[PDB]
Write a protein that binds this ligand. Structure first.
Ligand code: GWE
Lengths: 532, 400
């Protein structure tokens, strides 16, 4: 049955016209099946037999009795845009715990909405002949596979659910694709009563809701998760055992494994990723190394762990703890009460051009903050492995505006600290190295060196080098040859940046070498001076 | 209603809604429900593909729609140089004025906006405006004949007071004593209710070079480095004689007696810096640019200009009480203060160069925004010298 609901005014993109796609010819076997399916839809009021007036047409096919398939790809190319049909999908950690939850499938089979009469002509299609005229039709309802159907379907369900919602504030209904999720904290019998009242309400609008045979029951499959009444678990992750792995297999496997590192602790893929080096074909077979076999082996075991979480309780605190798993790697878990996680996560190592750990910490805090607001509409209280004095010292001086929402210190190693802090003033009694480096940027031949106030000096010859690398190399040599306290003068513009940001990680192996050196010194003062 | 269109070839805004806090989502739902009843806005379908960000600010919540994009695409349509001279200016929010006025039926779809749903459990609530929206370029424009009429009396009554309107704001500027000023304001509010800036003080501070009993190699180094850079603003600045004392490989800490030539060079330089570079004038055909640098510990420096090194204005902003642990709070505060002065002075907002990471700012700025308008901004990496240089800006003898 069709619904007695107003139509939404649809239009075709700017100036474009309806499709005129030639009907792919079929076999007598397929035509008969289509002619049947279509006579059934014609009586239901879904399609209308139409004349030659219509210059438009969409191809119809036969798949599997037989099932009909209309290829609207072309209509969809010429159909106006709509408001992005709810793009962000719900995360189980944001679902409030409810006593009862029931799923109502309002799919197309059960849900038929009328089409904007003005637009119906563009949906025209033709059932071929055995040479002679074929049978022409057009849709009177939202076609399955057409661009606007998901949006108009959702908009319609919303209009229809408005009354019920105002009348049952103790009940919450979530919309996602063809399904309605209805939950409440009412007594199970009362809950069931309201579901039935709703079903009867959709029935009134032309929505024949489900069959006892098509009713979904707990747990629920929510994109890799299993939603149980009091908690969620994750659908088993299967790692195929083989004696022959191709590039494609390894990549797929890495893919599936990277997703698991989010929920599971200890997942590693370094040795499996190594297998991808120099690969010439996807089908190419790469023998697993010894370490890859072990890694894969240990992961199979980690995935046999019963990782579970719980649901949201708005009357309780929202807490998020963070750990540094390695340089640039951050792990986190958001919970309300100790050990009962709502959600856990990991942020792939960021390979910046140059940054520091405290900065990377704020970036993790910000990503979690954004995630939380989406999921819970609130920001968590943070537990960060950094002292309040370390934070104060860094942020207050840093050239860039930065911030962390309300947080507290949790002493869980390793802790994030400032690996070094350039002196504010020149060091008295410390050798002063005047460094300098130059190179022909074309020949890439250069020299680096220094001359200290104490008479010490050096110059190194470098081939295949840039001017930047020599200048930085100059600084590096001064750091090597100096004592634990050193003043260094340079006209390097990039060094000026180091004084400002004082990075502890970067893209240059050279800068990295310098940082290791900076860290090792007890005192370092960097002074920049204009060249010449 | 008068027909309003988009600039030629411009299509409507399709800006996505940022996530909001449950607090703000609840607030907007309540505000918008009441507005629907009063016929100011109406729910819309999915056939309307446009969208404009919306949010709530501030002890009850106010709805604030980010129309920057739409304002840009809206067809085009004077400034009282006297406002900037006045002793005191008070700012007033006159956005409610617009609700009465209807918006062309054909333009409404472009005002579409969405109230998001927590955890994406439900589709957002879509609306569009029926009447003039607060924050849109066209509103102050359309409601102009109506605004003059209501202002004529108060104006003609007090020809000494200047009143300037920007977006939803009204800047009232006069010369009366603080009390006589606040009194004139209510007389106006009453007049309106029936339907603390000080520009003369905003003095441009000069750059001051350090003076020392004795100078060290480093002292001169840092000094010469800044003067060199500054040579881009003032070509008469010289570092020759100073750079000579820097000959050799002395210890960064060694004291260097200054030659008489370096002493004079330092004196000529101080004199040049005594005043703002000559020949800088505001150009209406050009955009205003506001650059901010984080000096640290609550201090911020900014420069307003249109051409690099040709400042129209520069200044310092010290963080306000109760903003200590919040860099984002301090920056938005500063942005609003600078934008306000900009309006007062030129009647337009400047585009900002903010020393903050995109993600950091976009996540928290609305939490401390308090203006009806929103300026344009871009995120940047502060050059070390630009910071070191404006840090040299002069400050009060004892204070103020
Ligand atoms: C899974 C469950 C079963 C029972 S019951 N009736 O005892 O079997 C009671 C509560 C729950 N769940 C909860 O407490 C928390 O979960 C929920 C809390 C409220 C609502 Cl309305 C639905 C759920 C879901 O479990 C759920 C399941 C899905 F597949 C998809 C979605 C959605 F699309 F909305 F994201 C939500």
């Amino acid at each position: 049955p069709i619904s007695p609901i107003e139509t939404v005014p649809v239009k075709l993109k700017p100036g474009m016209d309806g499709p005129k796609v030639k009907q792919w010819p079929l076999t007598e076997e397929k035509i008969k099946a289509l002619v049947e399916i279509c006579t059934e839809m014609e009586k239901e009021g879904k399609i209308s037999k139409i004349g030659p007036e219509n210059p438009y047409n969409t191809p119809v096919f036969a798949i599997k009795k037989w099932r009909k398939l209309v290829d609207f790809r072309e209509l969809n190319k010429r159909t106006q845009d709509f408001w992005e049909v709810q793009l962000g999908i719900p995360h189980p950690a944001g679902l409030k715990k409810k006593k009862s939850v029931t799923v109502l499938d309002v799919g197309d089979a059960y849900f038929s909405v009328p089409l904007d009469e003005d637009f119906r002509k563009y949906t025209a299609f033709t059932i071929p002949s055995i040479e002679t005229p074929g049978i022409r039709y057009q849709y009177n309802v939202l076609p399955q596979g057409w661009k606007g159907s998901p949006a108009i379907f959702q908009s319609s369900m919303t209009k229809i659910l408005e009354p019920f919602r105002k009348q049952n504030p103790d009940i919450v209904i979530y919309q996602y694709m063809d399904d309605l999720y209805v939950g409440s904290d009412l007594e199970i019998g009362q809950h069931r009563t309201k579901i039935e009242e709703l079903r009867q309400h959709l029935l009134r609008w032309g929505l024949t809701t489900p069959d006892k045979k098509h009713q979904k029951e707990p747990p629920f499959l929510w994109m890799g998760y299993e939603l149980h009444p009091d908690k969620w678990t994750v659908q088993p992750i299967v790692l195929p055992e083989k004696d022959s792995w191709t590039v494609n297999d390894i990549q797929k496997l890495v893919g599936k494994l990277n997703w698991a590192s989010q929920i599971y602790p200890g997942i590693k893929v370094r040795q499996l990723c190594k297998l991808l080096r120099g690969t010439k074909a996807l089908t190419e077979v790469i023998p697993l190394t010894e370490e890859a076999e072990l890694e894969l082996a240990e992961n199979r075991e980690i995935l046999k762990e019963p990782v579970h979480g719980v649901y949201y309780d708005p009357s309780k605190d929202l807490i998020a703890e963070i750990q540094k798993q390695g340089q640039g790697q951050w792990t986190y878990q958001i919970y309300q009460e100790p050990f009962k996680n709502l959600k856990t996560g990991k942020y792939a190592r960021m390979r910046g051009a140059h940054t520091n750990d405290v900065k990377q910490l704020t970036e993790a805090v910000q990503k979690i903050t954004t995630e939380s607001i989406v999921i819970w509409g609130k920001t968590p209280k943070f537990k960060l492995p950094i002292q309040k004095e370390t934070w104060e010292t860094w942020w207050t001086e840093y050239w860039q505006a930065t911030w962390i929402p309300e947080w507290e210190f949790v002493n869980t190693p390793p802790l994030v600290k400032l690996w070094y802090q350039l002196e504010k003033e020149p060091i008295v009694g410390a050798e002063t190295f005047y460094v300098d480096g130059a190179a022909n940027r074309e020949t890439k031949l250069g020299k680096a060196g220094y001359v200290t106030n104490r008479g010490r000096q050096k110059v190194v010859t470098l081939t295949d080098t840039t001017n930047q690398k020599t200048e930085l190399q100059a600084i590096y040599l001064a750091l090597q040859d100096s004592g634990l306290e050193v003043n260094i003068v340079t006209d390097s513009q990039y060094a000026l940046g180091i004084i400002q940001a004082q990075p502890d990680q970067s893209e240059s192996e050279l800068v990295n070498q310098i940082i290791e050196q900076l860290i090792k010194k007890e005192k370092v003062y960097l002074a920049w001076v204009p060249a010449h | 209603t008068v027909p309003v269109k988009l600039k030629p070839g411009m299509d409507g805004p399709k800006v996505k809604q940022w996530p909001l806090t449950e607090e703000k989502i609840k607030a907007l739902v309540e505000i918008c429900t009441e507005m629907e009843k009063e016929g100011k806005i109406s729910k819309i379908g999915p056939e309307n593909p446009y969208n404009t960000p919306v949010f709530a600010i501030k002890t009850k919540w106010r709805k604030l729609v980010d129309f920057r994009e739409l304002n840009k695409r809206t067809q085009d349509f004077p400034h009282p140089a006297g406002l900037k001279k006045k002793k005191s200016v008070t700012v007033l929010d006159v956005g409610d004025a617009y609700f009465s006025v209807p918006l062309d039926e054909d333009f409404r779809k472009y005002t579409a906006f969405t109230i998001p749903s927590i955890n994406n459990e439900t589709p957002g609530i879509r609306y569009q405006y029926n009447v003039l929206p607060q924050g849109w370029k066209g509103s102050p424009a359309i409601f102009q004949s109506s605004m003059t009429k209501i202002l004529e009396p108060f104006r003609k009554q007090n020809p000494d007071i200047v009143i300037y309107q920007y977006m939803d704001d009204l800047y009232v500027g006069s010369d009366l004593e603080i009390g006589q000023h606040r009194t004139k304001i209510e007389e106006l509010r009453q007049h309106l209710l029936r339907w603390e800036l000080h520009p003369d003080k905003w003095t441009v501070q000069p750059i001051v070079l350090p003076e020392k009993d004795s100078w060290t190699v480093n002292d001169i180094q840092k000094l010469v480095g800044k003067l060199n850079w500054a040579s881009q603003i003032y070509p008469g600045i010289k570092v020759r004689q100073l750079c000579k004392l820097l000959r050799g490989t002395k210890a960064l800490t060694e004291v260097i007696p200054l030659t008489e030539e370096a002493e004079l060079e330092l004196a000529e330089n101080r004199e040049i810096l005594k005043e703002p570079v000559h020949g800088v004038y505001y150009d209406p055909s050009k955009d205003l640019i506001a650059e901010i640098q984080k000096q640290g510990q609550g201090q911020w420096t900014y420069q307003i200009y249109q051409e690099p090194f040709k400042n129209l204005k520069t200044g310092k902003y010290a963080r306000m009480r109760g903003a200590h642990t919040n860099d984002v709070k301090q920056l938005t505060e500063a942005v609003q203060k600078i934008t306000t002065e900009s309006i007062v002075i030129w009647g337009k907002t400047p585009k900002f160069k903010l020393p903050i990471q995109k993600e950091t700012w976009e996540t928290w700025w609305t939490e401390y925004w308090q203006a009806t308008w929103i300026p344009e901004w871009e995120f940047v990496n502060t050059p070390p010298l630009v910071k070191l240089w404006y840090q040299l800006e002069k400050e009060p003898i004892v204070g103020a």
